[PDB]
Amino acid sequence: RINTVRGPITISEAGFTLTHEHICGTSAGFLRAWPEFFGSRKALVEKAVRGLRRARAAGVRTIVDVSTFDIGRDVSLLAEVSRAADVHIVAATGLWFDPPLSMRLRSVEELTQFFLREIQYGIEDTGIRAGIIKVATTGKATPFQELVLRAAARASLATGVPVTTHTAASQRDGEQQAAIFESEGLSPSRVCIGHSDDTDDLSYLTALAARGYLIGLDGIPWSAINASASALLGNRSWQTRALLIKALIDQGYMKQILVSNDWTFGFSSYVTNIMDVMDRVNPDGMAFIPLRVIPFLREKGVPQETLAGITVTNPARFLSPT
Amino acid sequence: DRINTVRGPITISEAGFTLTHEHICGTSAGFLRAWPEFFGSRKALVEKAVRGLRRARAAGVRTIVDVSTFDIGRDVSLLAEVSRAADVHIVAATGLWFDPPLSMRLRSVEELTQFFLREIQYGIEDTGIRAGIIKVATTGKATPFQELVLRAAARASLATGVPVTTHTAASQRDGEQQAAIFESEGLSPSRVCIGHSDDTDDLSYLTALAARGYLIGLDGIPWSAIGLEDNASASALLGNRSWQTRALLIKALIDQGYMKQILVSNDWTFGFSSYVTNIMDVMDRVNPDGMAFIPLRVIPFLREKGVPQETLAGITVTNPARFLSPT
Numbered sequence: 061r062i063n064t065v066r067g068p069i070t071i072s073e074a075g076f077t078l079t080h081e082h083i084c085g086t087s088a089g090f091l092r093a094w095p096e097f098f099g100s101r102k103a104l105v106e107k108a109v110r111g112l113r114r115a116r117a118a119g120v121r122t123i124v125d126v127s128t129f130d131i132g133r134d135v136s137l138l139a140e141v142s143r144a145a146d147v148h149i150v151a152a153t154g155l156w157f158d159p160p161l162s163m164r165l166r167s168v169e170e171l172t173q174f175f176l177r178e179i180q181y182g183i184e185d186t187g188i189r190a191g192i193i194k195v196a197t198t199g200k201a202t203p204f205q206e207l208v209l210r211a212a213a214r215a216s217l218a219t220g221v222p223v224t225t226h227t228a229a230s231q232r233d234g235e236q237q238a239a240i241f242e243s244e245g246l247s248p249s250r251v252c253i254g255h256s257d258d259t260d261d262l263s264y265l266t267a268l269a270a271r272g273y274l275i276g277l278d279g280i281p282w283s284a285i286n287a288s289a290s291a292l293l294g295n296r297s298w299q300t301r302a303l304l305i306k307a308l309i310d311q312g313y314m315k316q317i318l319v320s321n322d323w324t325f326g327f328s329s330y331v332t333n334i335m336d337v338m339d340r341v342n343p344d345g346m347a348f349i350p351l352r353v354i355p356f357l358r359e360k361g362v363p364q365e366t367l368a369g370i371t372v373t374n375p376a377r378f379l380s381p382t
Numbered sequence: 383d384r385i386n387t388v389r390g391p392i393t394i395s396e397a398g399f400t401l402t403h404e405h406i407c408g409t410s411a412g413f414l415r416a417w418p419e420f421f422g423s424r425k426a427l428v429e430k431a432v433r434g435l436r437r438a439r440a441a442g443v444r445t446i447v448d449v450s451t452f453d454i455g456r457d458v459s460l461l462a463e464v465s466r467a468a469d470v471h472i473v474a475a476t477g478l479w480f481d482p483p484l485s486m487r488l489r490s491v492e493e494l495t496q497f498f499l500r501e502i503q504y505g506i507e508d509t510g511i512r513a514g515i516i517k518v519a520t521t522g523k524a525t526p527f528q529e530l531v532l533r534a535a536a537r538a539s540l541a542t543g544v545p546v547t548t549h550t551a552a553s554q555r556d557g558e559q560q561a562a563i564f565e566s567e568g569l570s571p572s573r574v575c576i577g578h579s580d581d582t583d584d585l586s587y588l589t590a591l592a593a594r595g596y597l598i599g600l601d602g603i604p605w606s607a608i609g610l611e612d613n614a615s616a617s618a619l620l621g622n623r624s625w626q627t628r629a630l631l632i633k634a635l636i637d638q639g640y641m642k643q644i645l646v647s648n649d650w651t652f653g654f655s656s657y658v659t660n661i662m663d664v665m666d667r668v669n670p671d672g673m674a675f676i677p678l679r680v681i682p683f684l685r686e687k688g689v690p691q692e693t694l695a696g697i698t699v700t701n702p703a704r705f706l707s708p709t
């Protein structure tokens with residue numbers, strides 16, 4: 061009962077899934093208005109097809125595109141790349157930290173209708189329904205960012221669809237988001253505190269993992285080992301971020317881990333050549349988790365059925381509507 | 383002599399009575415397609431727009447310049463559909479207003495110049511519809527990004543001959559900073575309209591810009607929140623100045639010899655989502671005439687005050703014709 065861009069699929073059809081990915085990290089209407097920024101729309105489709113086929117050959121069967129309205133989600137692009145690559149792509153709703161005036165002047169009740177429109181009816185005029193809700197917070201929650209967290213909760217409770225968040229982990233936003241989700245009546249088993257790998261703090265993660273929250277260790281290839289790339293991605297290495305997966309397995313929270321790359325095939329919501337800077341830091345792309353992180357954990361003393369539990373059974377339990 | 387409309391190129395003589403600053407929808411990038419239910423439905427918005435433009439046409443309007451940019455949620459397909467059904471020429475816009483998303487605000491002046499050029503020379507999105515005007519904006523002192531938008535607009539105008547029109551916080555005298563930046567790029571004042579100029583009563587500011595060759599946009603004549611001072615949202619947007627006060631600025635500029643520098647419009651819309659929810663209903667109640675307000679209520683008002691019919695015809699037909707013509 062998991063909604064994808066090609067239609068509804070079952071829990072067994074999901075397989076190896078990456079919980080936090082992006083085909084394109086852009087802005088609302090941007091891809092349609094300026095496709096030449098990515099070379100052409102043809103070039104972005106071709107680069108995304110080759111990148112997903114690389115992930116499929118590596119073991120991945122499903123990717124969850126957490127690109128929201130304001131990240132410039134184009135479900136028609138998501139459907140085209142999914143068809144040519146034979147990889148299941150799950151679409152998303154919600155609002156990130158770049159909402160336009162028509163979204164930021166809306167009440168909590170109006171934002172619930174929009175989220176409920178994209179999950180129950182469909183996205184735009186395509187009929188494609190959203191299977192996950194993406195929300196954001198950069199530091200302490202602004203008066204509007206609180207309404208998005210609450211609206212995402214009211215939409216998750218009426219459909220059963222899960223929530224995934226953006227967090228500035230060094231500032232520990234996951235505790236405030238958790239306090240807001242719990243005040244709304246949302247079950248912690250339906251929420252994923254993303255970007256939790258941006259910190260080396262383990263005491264903040266185990267506290268949330270004990271309450272039932274899923275920990276999103278999603279930006280593993282993000283290593284700044286360029287003032288723009290050093291501020292966006294990486295103070296530490298990938299080995300340090302991948303050791304945080306092992307540190308949570310050792311504490312007995314193997315059922316709460318969700319791994320991903322947080323990769324893109326086109327990036328426009330930052331500096332011009334950030335995609336070219338990223339493409340060489342990680343030449344593996346979206347295939348970094350099964351080819352470089354899984355054999356690392358196998359060498360550092362973690363069995364294959366613990367890793368096959370994190371990648372197959374954990375995201376399938378998360379993405380299933382309850 | 384030839385200008386781009388959403389139905390294709392037309393000869394300037396066919397433009398006729400032209401409203402220089404209007405919107406079919408005041409929204410945000412991708413909003414109409416992602417949430418048409420905000421406006422009832424996409425079909426309801428089209429029907430309302432067609433009815434409004436048909437009524438405006440019956441009153442004498444032949445062309446409107448939709449100054450909706452990418453970030454005002456310009457949907458050219460909607461503009462084309464309504465233009466064809468109402469049989470009113472609609473000139474589309476490029477440029478950037480004051481709500482650009484991350485992918486726009488992180489761009490350099492060279493990249494923004496290429497985006498504006500693409501929308502004028504090649505087309506908007508995958509439609510083939512080309513922009514006939516560049517819309518820019520400042521709300522007080524220009525931010526570093528707004529300065530880049532103004533420079534890119536000036537560069538695209540110099541390369542194509544297409545005019546530039548602006549949004550200003552008129553009380554803050556924004557037109558002076560805008561003018562300075564445009565002229566630093568070598569753009570002729572005759573290719574620029576300093577809009578929302580009816581938001582101020584400072585005639586010294588207006589005549590000085592007009593004296594330099596700038597077109598003065600007295601473009602929101604029906605905007606008045608008198609009678610509804612209890613509505614904090616409507617008062618902050620529409621202001622407390624009467625439609626008459628805004629319209630008398632057209633007479634004031636004519637009297638000082640600047641009839642050739644005046645552009646008049648309503649700054650109306652059929653859908654409004656970039657503000658509070660009830661705003662379109664409130665606006666439609668204050669002004670039931672919509673875009674027809676200029677020929678039905680403003681033109682006869684100025685005739686009562688003594689302005690000749692040939693001067694008014696010069697402001698509504700000749701001035702927009704000279705402005706829109708690629709020069």
Ligand SMILES: [Co+2]
Pocket residue numbers: 226227255
């Ligand atoms: Co993020």
Ligand SMILES: [Co+2]
Pocket residue numbers: 080081082126322
């Ligand atoms: Co992301």
Ligand SMILES: [Co+2]
Pocket residue numbers: 549550578
């Ligand atoms: Co304006």
Ligand SMILES: [Co+2]
Pocket residue numbers: 403404405449649
């Ligand atoms: Co306007």
